[PDB]
Symmetry: D2
Subunit: 151 residues, 4 copies
């Protein structure tokens, strides 16, 4: 069982059931946990970025999915939480490499920037692709953890 | 009155480092590049250079940063670990503009392996030239990012 | 007055009024002419690609806008009409350069690939950006016309 | 039983021409690159090389073509002028896959100025390896493209 927490702001609300669906499409072991808004009225992305990022950091869930206008807001605010490696992806390549090289634990996408079928592909690829485990990446990821600790 | 812009890369982006320097100048006379990346070909660790540039931005030694890696991802994660930093992974003109308009982003991140140099150029120029909107919901949202930083 | 004919298939139907709106947003001189489907049921992209491309070729309208799943189908089928330079754009850069270098007369976009705000930006940039008029491009565009004539 | 793949570029894509050759091989043993672009640095006219490769595909001398220019656009326009050709401008994995699945595309077009080499690699590989679906609505739509060609 690999839980994936889902967060959005208002531009991504209309596509939230899509994101739920795309998590389950990655495999039966992938369980979506919807932590986004309940209504379509404006909300502030940091509020929902924080909720999902804290769950990931605390290890309640293995993965996060965050959507907003461009995904930029989500990736900045999620990365403020220690333990989070939030990757803003715009295609299949960035989704795969975020996992292989960076061991990313949160994938961020933009609703106004990336079509839903590419959002589908991103989410599925992010979840299914393993971290390489290579020495250099393991070292670089540990160096990100050391930047957190120095602050 | 002129605006400093620090540039960092790891090894795959080293091959285009004078490109990055050039594109910063291309945004206007008032933009001064500050090269902080691998002085040479050397395979290096992106978080070391993201930190160098991220710290300069957070200390207000430069106004903006430009970071390049393979996909841009490692640079955006590592730079966002520094409080005071809003580092945006951009891949086209629209994200470069909106990162500024909505998020008041102070670091632009790009991948050399994903995004062609003429779009990287367009990203950098758009980033540097586009102003923050100052609009109420955006200020409040940026403050909420700061409040998150304060809690950790 | 610069008429712009608009064509879609079914995945782009839900966003057809968007495309109408984005044409007018480029300027008051830009007049949208909707030539896409009236209902959301499946249709074949070549049918609507051809209608718009023929209007452009015959010079009824100055410009075309075509949307489908990925935009690939639209750009292949529209380019089959002599006189058409249909450019599949996915960002601002490709929209600008399609006009500056290629003198493109039709812009093609994918609904499932490119978010509407980037589709907005593409359409506005395509319409507002002039052809450079440079010798080399004028020569290359004339060489495209010579490929048509040899078939 | 092995599948030939002709490659053409103009001048900005010349710098990555052995990349393109390499990536075609990377899709499998059964893929044979056929280099047809500028043998040298020379500033050239994209329609001359789009034609060379487009004609080889239409004559069935090769099964696939790969075309690279600045933005990929001029290559897709010029190659689509040859009857029998379905040339797709792709910029990521999804368009590369769908061009094959839905449109049975026989030429892949890319921009060196817009799309980074590792994604160009991914585009080429995905294009070559992904099969046409053969599904009814797609066959009919492809035939309608042919019927358009016949009318001119
Ligand atoms: O894209 C975003 N953050 O990156 C936000 O979703 C975006 O600013 C929301 O904008 P809006 O409040 O005009 O809808
Ligand atoms: O993509 C990146 N960071 O996100 C880095 O540039 C990447 O890890 C470099 O990988 P390499 O060590 O295979 O060159
Ligand atoms: O993207 C397209 N042509 O490029 C078409 O819109 C696409 O094949 C439509 O697919 P569908 O018939 O499964 O909706
Ligand atoms: O983008 C292209 N065709 O679409 C071409 O590579 C482009 O016209 C080359 O332009 P240049 O003549 O400035 O190098």
């Amino acid at each position: 069982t690999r839980r994936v927490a889902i967060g959005t702001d208002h531009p991504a609300f209309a596509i939230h059931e899509n994101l739920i669906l795309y998590v389950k499409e990655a495999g039966d072991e992938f369980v979506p946990v919807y932590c986004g808004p309940k209504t379509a009225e404006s909300v502030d992305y940091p509020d929902f970025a924080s909720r999902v990022a804290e769950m990931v950091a605390r290890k309640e869930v293995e993965f996060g999915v965050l959507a907003c206008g461009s995904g930029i807001g989500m990736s900045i605010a999620a990365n403020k939480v220690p333990g989070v490696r939030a990757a803003l992806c715009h295609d299949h390549y960035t989704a795969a490499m975020s996992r292989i090289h960076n061991d990313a634990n949160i994938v961020c996408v933009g609703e106004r920037t990336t079509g839903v079928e590419v959002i589908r592909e991103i989410i599925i690829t992010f979840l299914q692709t393993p971290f390489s485990g290579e020495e250099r990446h393991v070292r670089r990821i540990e160096k990100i953890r050391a930047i957190e600790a120095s602050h």
